[model samples]
Target: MSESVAIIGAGLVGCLAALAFSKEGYNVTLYDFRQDPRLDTTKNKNLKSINLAISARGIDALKSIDPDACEHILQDMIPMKGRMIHDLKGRQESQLYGEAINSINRSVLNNSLLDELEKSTTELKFGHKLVKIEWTDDKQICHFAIGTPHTEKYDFVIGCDGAYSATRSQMQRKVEMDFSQEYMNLRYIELYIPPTEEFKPNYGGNFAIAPDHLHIWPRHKFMLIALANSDGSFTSTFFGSKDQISDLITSKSRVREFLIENFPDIINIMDLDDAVKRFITYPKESLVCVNCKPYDVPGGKAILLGDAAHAMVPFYGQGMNCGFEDVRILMALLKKHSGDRSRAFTEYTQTRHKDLVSITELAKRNYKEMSHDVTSKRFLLRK
Candidate 1:
């Protein structure tokens, strides 16, 4: 009595779900609108995303799926044991928080997951955009865009698309789901700091600064952060009000002066001209907090997971972790019910809403703590 499931979106969460479902003896088919990302010609490479932090929650989920794959995917991650804060006077302070969290690149993890899927029994379909879903009593008819004979039927469906999820919109037509999205008044741009020429044993490898810490230059209203890569180079990001980024991008000289004035230490570690050039030319991204209730259709006709269900800002670095956990949690529920999707899905919506809401709220709260509160003298006392 193996059931067939059509999973929309082949991202991290969607790929994990496909793998898990396949391991459970279910017929799983994964679909994505874009071409295979591993190919050089796919084009829409979303590299503007900030570096992701992988903590225990995410690792535990991966281990649950396949311990070996988890170990392999995480080999490139750089350990992040603490936060290194930079002051206006170029003084550095270390705050330790050993949660075993690490910094990881986005595309590497995505492409790795795709590779794993290729080895699984799950059928992978690319370039198939879901335009509509015809819900019936026992099966789901998914229509893809090619304006041709691209419709298929499945026993159930899972949506893991993303913040602006088309699958989520499709589910709304069949369920009275409550949803809202709020865009923060912030913009982010990626910057870079090349590695030093010589390797430094004191700091480990070719790192110009401490490699085991997340470096932050907090200017209260705005901030800059950098996470280490294996090559000793750092993936740096700048975050500020949209107006602030817009004003700075108007003139190269203005950007140069601002960086020198705000983050003087970076001048020596990073080339100011290159940083400015990349800063202005880099793609700017926005952060949106999305929340939705009833993330499933009754009778298990369909369901939503990951960003499609509860998309939060990356301030807490839990967006991917939470999505990873979603796959694990849903799998656990399915096991508990012996694959009774109707019961499993309904229970998921009932029990998971509170935790999802909490994480989103915490992610929202942490933004201020990272940008403003950490540098304040009364930070610990106020809280």
Candidate 2:
């Protein structure tokens, strides 16, 4: 009989993990606390949705799992070849990424992955919130807070439940796991830019600016970044200190002055009044960095992947990419061990921690480079 695996979380990493394990001939059951995001009601209610940049690492992982599914899921993504830096005078400069990065709607990507999971033998249980886990020498028991609280047993568990992972907490009780979480002093607010009134054939859409570039408006202490959407609109985010955002949003005049002073060109394309309303009303989300040691249980009965293992700030844009890479690496190790999960997971814990730590630190450092150094003459020279 094939071993059963329970995956906690129905997000991107969890869905991908489910597909990978199912492909390995394991009986996989994916669980999530929330309802299906594909539902219109669920879609309209999400406030923290952000555009995801799928680079080589992310795409390669998807292709490795199922090439055909990869192509279909990424069909609507817009390729960004470079960064467009805007100055105070409304001047723009392009910095190329060389290999190009693709932008996709986050919800769409997650739903597509879920759709792929549905096609496979994997079982998806929505609205099942993982409450706790009971780990023993053999089978691992998972308890969920559904309508009536239920329990299920699986040979192993994969935790991709994200930054505030409940699975990670449960693992701590059973093992001595070193973990730390640090919140950055920065906060972010989402804003939007509608498409141009008319379509432009040269740009391939009704884009107010070049849709082929990731746009950035950098100031010393704060910055705004925008990525293209398939609908010709742009998903823009503003990042700054909490105090700065709070002070600016204190009044409409203050918000308008601050935006005009730092991002004058944006006001021309996006309605200043609407922008001010969102700037004040939208949630101010904080960024967190999580690091942990030994991401697996002793006997390979359970393991953590994605943000549950190493959650980093979005400055370097490697959070999801690294998580996808995690699946690829873990799958390779499992194959190398010939399905000996004990050996595979142990080796993974030993080898993966160093690399994850390095990236987490790099991501934190990149915040300084992105928010400030990008505008420095010395920094530009080095680049």
Compare the candidates by TM-score and give the number of the best one.
2
For every model shown, the clashing-pair count is: 0, 0
Q: Please give the lDDT score at residue 159 for candidate 1.
A: 95
In model 1, the Cα lDDT at residue 36 comes to 82
Model 2 misplacement above 4 A: 43-47, 374-383
TM-score for predicted model 1 compared with the true structure: 0.94
CA RMSD per model (angstroms): 3.0, 2.9
TM-score of each: 0.94, 0.95
- What would the per-residue lDDT of candidate 2 be over residues 1-383, giving only the tens digit for each residue? 79999999887889999999999999999998888788876644333556878888789998899777898999989989899998877789999873568889998888889889888999889889999999998899999998588999999999999989999999999989999998977788888999998998988998989999999887787888899998889999888888888888889998998888778789888888988998888675667788888899887889999989988877565788888999999999999999999999999998899787777677757766777566564222221
Candidate 1: global Cα-lDDT? Answer: 0.84
> For model 2, what is the alpha-carbon lDDT of residue 324?
93
lDDT of 1 by residue, 200-274 (tens): 998788988998999988876688889998889888888888889889889999999888878888998898888
Query: Model 1, poorest ten-residue lDDT window?
Result: 374-383
